[PDB]
């Protein structure tokens, strides 16, 4: 029964705009593509093509400062390092030109911890390391 | 410890003619006299530690039992929760009234009527009153400052001075909520001992109100740390000594203290 | 293991139109934008733009008076002071020209407390402190 | 710790068309507006205006008679007295020209109490008291 | 403390097309009307009118025969006697020209009882009693 | 004063032959020996005991039984307390 | 274990005149002396194994009970969780203080006052201190390296050296989350 290793999600290190972010809980990011389904004039099965891409991302975490409210709708980079401690092969991803969809100015319930949620869109990504 | 109880009973009770060890007195001893029998020492958990049992057997001249009832009330008043200092061993303690012997026995050959009052002593082994639980130290300090009563930290001590409070920790949970952050949750239960039950109610009420209003507690006089309250609950039925009335859940977030090297010097070179 | 802290949500102090509001339980506020996704004629990556911003906010709490029902749709300011206690760096946000979407005239179930819910929109904000 | 008070929702007293209603257990009513968002050249933030108002209301309760089915879609007033007990400042609201959206003719399950649900729309309101 | 009464929903007696139905579990029926909201040219609050009505109903129960599947989409009447027993004032409603929206031929899970569900529409109703 | 509560009877009905007698032991008890106050710092208990006394015209003994309770009566102890800070200003 | 307890009590307590077996001492014996009665061995589960009970009955010359209190404190200090080596058996152990006899008894015919201190010993039958649970071995090694105290893996051993820490496993669950992974 040789060793195997999942990647625990607490190994993530998120660098928002070149300064490390400590309080993020979860990060999500995908790279969409318009399918552009094409129904040919003679062939019965549909055909799809790459179309044009579009990045989207989301973040959640605990509020420790007003960094995101200060940031506005500016363009900024996100770098995401997911280390594998059992093999040391960290998978690093860089997102280019991220832009907040909405400033989370206020989001606070009385009896609970003040969490911050962020979502937006990024023009492109660089797979720095894998 | 026999000497302390004997000295207290002789000093405070004047109808008493003498207080003796178990099989000391002869048949010409002058009644009423008392006998201090020492019972078991049993382990009763972490909060109480070793609990000792004592009996103060009263003896009387078989005139009537009403005198024995009066003398029993006197003994209970003298010893119940009043701190006693034992000069022989130079250590104090505090007896707790537990009850009374099985029946009121008549002993015809001795021509006497006897009754056995039943006391006990808490935390025989504990002799430090200190804790490495920083949270318990912080909350005991907070309770002492707010309430102006003694506050014992980890477990009962045998010479506790009523009214008093205790702030033991009952349960600890640790979580790594992030790569850099950890969360430490403690369920800390608190006791409030006192002879007057309404004083227990008042002290618990003001302690709860203080904890709720000032929702966090300074962990140290240096500041830099705090203990945010989560939920404070009182179960008034619960035992004063074993369990404790007030239950409070505190949590605290800590950050990993990574102090790795630094990028003091950067250089680069070029080619084509 | 040096210190950190979460901003507990019971530290908020919400001033609605210059008079402090005591019974609020939850407050939300975001600053949207229309993305204006632009698909260039040669580049396969979609491109975003700031577009036009649009504030929105919401409130929940216990009903103590007919403040909101009497307020109508008039413009009013909201100030939100999220104090931090471990360190005293309160985060203060101001909302300009807030306008209720709907007057919560009546909302009351038989066996429960009468809570008030409010939502609307605000033209802009001022990050007073941080 | 000076006294405060929550308005328990069992103090409601609903008068539907001048006759007191005993079996209602939940009442909702709002005064919606139309946002009328407008873009202006040289002004990035959107602007809102009042638009035209539109009332809506809802009721739930136990079925005791066929009052609502007999009512049809006739116009009828609703009055809502939310009394407060710690202080006697009842908040009274009147709804003008309420009109049922649908007659709940039959709504009954075998094992449960027969509850009635109602919702409609009211042209305007009069805040009688507060 | 003077008596009140709730109409338990197990007092319902449903007659579908003149023959009593005795396996039904719940029945719903409402009389929808298109609101036809009108925005007058000078007044700043919407106005509603009765518009055109349209009935809708629904039943659930245990399958005991192929009554509904054999009924097809034929027009048929439904009576509904909600008897009250504390006081004998039964509420009786008739539905005119009911028509199944979908003929429930088969609906059956392996390990459970075979229940039948029906939904449709009725042109009008007659409040026979109350 | 005090108020004895009937609890039962001795194990069997015994016959003591030498004394030429038949004996039975009835078994009573007395409640709250050490209590001597009939008062409470719990304002809620005081309020409800006052309310019960006014409504019901019987005694009310607040936090704990007292040995000389006059039946019929009604005690109003508090068994469990929960405090919450529901808001910055409210508890 | 009688020899070990007797030797420890004689060596560490100097007021002691002798420590005997149960029905050894005659009426010519010089008080205070002690008696080592050995109780039951009972199975107390997997973690403790068989637990033995011991009583060290102190006897004193009926001068006053304060002497007996001092002697009891001395015995408890000497034996409570201090590892003892029995040279006769060449096998160590560690007595755990557990309590005291029912009452402080006076015995008039012997003209003495007696009190019985009550000890116990843990995991009599365990003689390996090894485990096939690789997880327990790994965590005991980790605890020893981090903490600089002994670690005893599967179950207690009778000669445990306080301070220490056991790392038994209480519950195991296996799942086949995938075709290839467990």
Residue numbers in the entry:
A (entry chain D), C (entry chain E), D (entry chain F), E (entry chain A): 7 to 136
B (entry chain H): 1 to 272
F (entry chain N): 92 to 182
G (entry chain L): 1 to 182
Sentences copied from the publication:
The overall RMSD between all proteins of the neck in the extended state compared with the contracted state is 0.34 Å, indicating that no large conformational change occurs in this region during phage contraction. After contraction and genome release, the neck-proximal tail sheath protein (gp55) remains attached to the tail terminator gp53 via its C-terminal insertion domain. The neck-proximal sheath protein rotates to accommodate the contraction-induced movements of the other sheath proteins in the tail below, pivoting around Gly260 in the gp53 C-terminal linker. The terminal sheath ring proximal to the neck proteins still maintains some contact with the tail tube. This reduced rotation is limited to the proximal layer, with the next layer below fully dissociating from the tail tube, similar to the arrangement observed for the main body of the contracted tail reconstruction.
